[PDB]
Every structure is written in C-alpha cells, then in structure tokens.
Structure 1
Amino acid sequence: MLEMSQERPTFYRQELNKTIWEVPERYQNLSPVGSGAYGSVCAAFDTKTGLRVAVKKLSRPFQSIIHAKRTYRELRLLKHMKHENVIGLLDVFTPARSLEEFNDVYLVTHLMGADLNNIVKCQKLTDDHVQFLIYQILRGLKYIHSADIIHRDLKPSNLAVNEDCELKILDFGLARHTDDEMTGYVATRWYRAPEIMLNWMHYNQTVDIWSVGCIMAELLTGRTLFPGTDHIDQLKLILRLVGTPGAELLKKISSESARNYIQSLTQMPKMNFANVFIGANPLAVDLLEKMLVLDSDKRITAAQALAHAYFAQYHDPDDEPVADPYDQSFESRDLLIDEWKSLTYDEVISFVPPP
C-alpha cells in the first residue's frame, strides 16, 4: 500500500551540439532544436509513454544565489501545474546518484507543435476559433489564479496550440525580463498591463486579464492592440482607447511622479469599442470592455469571464477546476547557493510521474 524505495533507471551519454546529455534509456532519438539562454533543448521520443517530448538541460543552474533560486522557482512551478490548459511537467531527472555529485537538471515537457503566432500566420481565425482559444486561456487562468500564481507575461508566443485548436499556457518560472528587453518597439511589452509597465502600484492577478484582453483583440482584428514604440507612446495608445484615469484610480497610484505625469496629459473619454472593433461579435466587444479597464480593481476575473455569454458553447462550471494551494514562502526567504541547490535536489528526486 505504500512503497519505500525508488528504482534509478539506466542512463546513457552522448554529445549533442558541443554538449553532453545524460538521459534515461527511455528517451530516444534526441535532436537539438534551440536554446533560450537557460539551457538547450532536444526533441525526443519517450518510448515509455509514446509521447514526443522536449528535454531541457538547464544551463549553469546553480551559478549564483540568483540563478540557483531561479532554478528552484521554475521546478516548483512546473511541478505544481496539473491542468489541461497549462504546461505540466512530464519528468525531471539528474544522472547524479547523490547530492555530492548533483550538478545538472533536465526538464521534460510535451513537445510543442506551434504557438499562437505560428497559428495566426498560417491562416485566418474565425470567431468560433477565437471563442475557443480565449475560453481555454481563461480556463487555465482560473486554475493558475486559484493558487495565487501570477503568470505576469501572457503573450501569443507563450501559448501553444495544436491541430485541434487546443491550447496550453507556457513559460512560467523564467528569469524576469530586463529593462533593455522591455525597451522600444517590442512584443515583450505590448501586452503588459499599464500598472506594471510604469510601476504605478503593487500588481496582482489582474494584470493577466489585461494581457488576455490584448490577445483577444489581436485575434479578432489581426492587429497588435497597443503597438507602442516605447513605454510612453504605448501609454498614449492605451489612454486613447481606454480614457485618461479618473480620480479614484489616481489615488491608487503610489508613485507621485506617475501621478504628476498622468495629470499633465489632456484628458480623454473612453472610446466606443463598438466603433473600434467594427464588425466584431457584439459579445466579444462587451467582453473586451470588461477586460480592458484601466483600473485593475474593476477588471473582470477569469472565473467571471468563463460565465460570459461569449463562451456559451464551451462553458461548463463542472469542468473548470481549481488548483491545490501553492506555497510561495520561499520567494521571501534568503538562503545560500548550496541551500537553494539542496532544496532543488530534494524536489528532483521526489518527483512523482503522472498516471
């Protein structure tokens, strides 16, 4: 009824594009397909499950306090996700037989066919296609938010889609974007809620819904909603559509510099979305209105959005599950390199495979 030991499988070694790979026999025909900066990934066949998978060998994972904590953070997040519309962890392993020998971490996930950009480039999406894609994003977000997890960087490139229009949210852990990466005419910022683009206040769940808003608008119009050339140009694009802040919002803006700046802008009324998204399903227009609200406190939540008439064909309250609590205390904890490395090691060897 219990089980008290673990069977360490047999590993095999090989050099793939300058680097060594030590993986379980299980995984066959490895072929390099890229990097990312946090390591390189090979595509492989998992003969034990019959799945095409992505194997990621983390790169210098315990290089510093910061990197060792990134590593641990990513492993904790991925280990936690158990939902259809969210990237889950298929396997995680190290060839090391003890903590003394522990150096490398390999992460295994579903091999992803295409992301939302790839989908959008190969064809034009119908309204029903958009209903289904957004529903799924929101179904996954409900789950994510249940556990007080903020994705914080929702993007078409972070959304995998398959031949059946099924979708998963990708890219959680990840090293936060740097200032230079967020600078200029770049997709890395076009989907950001303004609260966090200019650091108006302390942010939360609600920033993800703004991102969904931008994504949905783009899928319907075929155009980036707020393609600013820089932080300020982007702000102007947003206030144009959504209106300059009223009094209640200005208060919630901690920073007084932001406040002073905002006020220096000629005021503007919300535009009529019906005239901005001409020809769109009126239910989509109404939903957008409820998503793209400047004051984050009054944004519709994922749970509520799933009940919106726009998703009538897919909504089913008994098939929209919630997550087990996710303990994030470690984010506030200060430890040494070898201490994050040990926590990480403990998480590797305690992995329980899916059914």
Structure 2
Amino acid sequence: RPTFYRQELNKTIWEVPERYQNLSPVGSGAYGSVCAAFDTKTGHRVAVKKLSRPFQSIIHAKRTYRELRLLKHMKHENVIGLLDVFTPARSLEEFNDVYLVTHLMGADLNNIVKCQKLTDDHVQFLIYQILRGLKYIHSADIIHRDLKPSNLAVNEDCELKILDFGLARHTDDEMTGYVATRWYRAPEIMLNWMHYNQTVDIWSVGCIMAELLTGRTLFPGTDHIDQLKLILRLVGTPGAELLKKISSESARNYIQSLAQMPKMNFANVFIGANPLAVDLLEKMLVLDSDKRITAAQALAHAYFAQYHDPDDEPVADPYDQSFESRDLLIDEWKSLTYDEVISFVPPP
C-alpha cells in the first residue's frame, strides 16, 4: 500500500498517494470533481477524478461498477485508457471513495473545428483514427452512444483519442431544445423508436465528418421535431418496408403524416469536397441502420488509402457484460467494485 496524504481544495477532501503532486482543480459535472496533477511514477500530466456519491442508490452503485469495468478493458491508441484507480480504504468495511486517473487531455475537436483551417489531408487522418478506435470498441460488442466533437481529444500532431463513453447518463432536460448534446444522435433513437445498437455510432461519425468539411453543424435542430425535419430533407423520407421496423403505431402515423421527400444530391450539399469524401458520407448517413457502412468496412474505403494498414488495425479482447441483466443489492455492487479496484494492474 502506498502512503496517502490529505488536503482540502475547493470545499473537497482529497486523499491520494504521494506519487500525485501539484493538484489543481479543473472542473466538476454531477458525476465527480477533477484535479490536474503531475504523476512522479510515470512523468505524465494526469486527470484525477474523485467520484461523487458513488454508492448512493442501486442505480448509482451499478453505474460506478459499469464505468470501472469499461475503463479497465480499453487498451487501444485511439481510446482513453485507465492509468490508475485507488481508494484510501484499507478494507471493504471502510470503503466509501473511488478515484480514477487518466492522461490529462488539452484540446478537443471543437477547438480545432471552430478555430483552425483543415485540409482534406487533416479530415482523412482525423476520421481514420475515429474509425480505427470504433473498430476496436465494436469488436468487444460495446456501443459508445455519445460521439460528438467535445468527446474527441486532439493534440498538436493531429493525434486523436475517443473518451466519455455513454454510461446511460443523459437526462430529458439535457436533450431538450437547441443543444449539441442531441445534434449528433441517430434518427431511429432520437425519440427511442428503435433499441440502441453499434450502428447508431456510425451516424455520429458522418455528422462529425460533415462538420470538419464545412465548418458548420450538419443538423442543428431547435428541438427533436425540427432536427428530424432537417435529417429527412437530406436523406429522404422512409418507404413502407423500413417504416414497419418501428413497433409504435403512433410514431408510424407521425412518420406517415409528413409529405414524401427524395434523398438530396450530396455533391451539391458538400460543394467542392473530395468526391471520395462525398461517397463515404452517402454510405454513413443512411436512414435504415441495417444498411450503413460498418467501421471495419469504412477503414478499407479508398478515401483512407494513404493511412489504411490492415495489419495495424487491432480488435479487442472479449468483454463480458452479463452484469447488465443482473439484479443485486447496493452492498453487492459495492463489493464487486472493491474487488476491481484491488485487482487493477497498471500498463507497462
């Protein structure tokens, strides 16, 4: 066991191993508080997240276990991984607090899309890396569920990492009105008309790629219905066969109430873009999720000819998610989480 030291920074007690120095507050959602620190063991600048109320309900205890299992699994150059996890507790009986340690990220895509001039070569390399990471994620039967520019970290050498996996977190208030939290989501799951599957992420990559090419949000809806009207004007309304896949009669009568519209000419929407970029956008932004290109298929598209290497596009170890269908008590979820903290082995 390392030696721990205690301090109060911005109304919060932080108890952390001596290896972590020069702690400085950086942010706090409702999920936890974050400090920047210098890790003396590895020489990296890191983010230290202290979870808030990790075991306050069955829902919160299960979400704590879910986040730790997912972070311990992810070992890929284009996906955030876990540098450390710790608790100052010396036994299960006194276990209350969980701290997570990752690489400190600087800029996100938003910073570079808003204020930088992007060549077609920059768009090829950024989208290649998103798809390389998604091939790995999807090979473990994980769905990200929240891909958007603020969840993509990018450095001065245009190298990219995926972060902030969807933990079944986002609330109704958070998805309401003129908000970036909804602009990248798939049409079939906008109002939960179909169940989630890894195909919804491929819609989000198309929305990101369009915005890197134009500098503008593709579907900036003022509410769920305005956003559906912008989507169907570009990709076309559905036909009878596809419509039948939505179980809810009300949604189909709602779908059935809009005037029919054809798919638009994407060369006349994305004026001047590389024709191979236009071709790949037509294969991602398909209304029927069964017909979208997969991450593994997209890596072999001619748009990525200068970067594609099928001997350096790895898949994941198998991921057991059977816990998701399991009914347990708060203390059972807490004991599973404790075992995962104490069994952690750090990377090389």
TM class, shorter-chain normalised?
A: over 0.9
Partners of 1:93 and 1:348 within 8 A in 2: yes
Map of 1:23 onto structure 2: 16
Task: Tell me, in whole angstroms, the C-alpha distance in 1 between the residues paired with 2:268 and 2:11.
Answer: 55
Q: What whole-Å deviation, never above 9, does each CA across 1:309-345 have from its counterpart, x for those lacking one? A: 1111110001100001111111111111111111101
Asked if the contact 1:85–1:136 (Cα under 8 Å) also holds between the matched residues in 2, the reply is yes
Residue pair 1:73, 1:173 contacting (<8 A) in 2 also = no
1:77/1:173 contact within 8 Å kept: no
Cα deviation for residue 249 of structure 1 reads 1.0
Displacement of 1:273 in angstroms is: 0.3
Assess if the C-alpha contact under 8 Å between 1:74 and 1:173 holds in 2.
Answer: no
CA-CA distance at 1:138 after TM superposition: 0.3
Sequence identity percentage: 99
- Give structure 1 regions of 4+ aligned residues with deviation exceeding 3 angstroms: none
CA offset digits 1:18-59 (Å, max 9, x no partner): 111111111111100110111100000111101010000000
Deviation of the 1:175 alpha carbon: 4.9
Question: Per-residue displacement from partner, 1:98-138 (whole Å, max 9, x unpaired)?
Answer: 00110000000000011111122331211111111100000
Deviations 1:49-85, CA, capped at 9 Å, x for gaps: 0101000000010011111111111000001100010
SS of 2:96's partner is coil
More moved, 194-203 vs 305-314: 194-203
Structure 2 residue aligned with 1:291: 284
- CA deviations on 1:192-228 (whole Å, 9 max, x unpaired) are 0011102222220100000000000001001100000
In 1, the alpha carbon distance for the partners of 2:108 and 2:129 equals 14
The total of aligned residue pairs comes to: 348
Asked if the contact 2:129/2:160 (under 8 Å) is kept, the reply is: yes
Q: Tell me which residue corresponds to 1:4.
A: none
Unaligned runs of 5+ in 1: 1-7
Q: Which residue of 2 aligns with 1:91?
A: 84
- Does the CA contact (< 8 Å) of 1:115 and 1:156 recur in 2? yes
TM-score (norm 2): 0.99
Deviation of residue 173 (structure 1)? Answer: 5.1
Compute the displacement of 1:155 (Å).
Answer: 0.5
**Cα distance in structure 1, aligned partners of 2:324 and 2:163:** 21
Task: Flag the 1:331–1:167 CA change in 2: closer, same or farther, 3 A.
Answer: same
Q: CA deviation at 1:258?
A: 1.1
**8 Å CA contact retained: 1:28, 1:45:** yes
What secondary structure, in the 3-state scheme, does the structure 2 residue paired with 1:344 have? Answer: helix
Q: Deviations over 1:249-269 (max 9, x none)?
A: 112112111111111110000
Matches within 5 A, 1:38-53: 38-53=31-46
TM-score for both structures, normalised by structure 1? 0.97
Is this contact kept in 1: 2:65–2:336, CA < 8 A? yes
Kept in 1: contact 2:61–2:333 (CA 8 A): yes
Counterpart of 1:351 in structure 2 is 344
Assess if the C-alpha contact under 8 Å between 1:147 and 1:324 holds in 2.
yes
Q: C-alpha separation between the residues in 1 aligned to 2:340 and 2:296?
A: 31
1:182 is aligned to: 175
Residue number among 156, 159, 165 corresponding to 1:166 in the alignment: 159
In 1, Cα distance between equivalents of 2:165 and 2:204 = 15
Instruction: Look up the match of 1:114.
Output: 107
Q: 2:196 and 2:242 mapped to 1: Cα distance?
A: 14
Give yes or no for contact 2:114–2:215 (8 Å, CA) kept in 1.
no
The more displaced of 199-208 and 75-84 is 199-208
Alpha-carbon distance in structure 1 between the residues aligned to 2:110 and 2:254: 35
Unaligned runs of 5+ in 2: none
- Between 314-323 and 197-206, report the one with greater CA deviation: 197-206
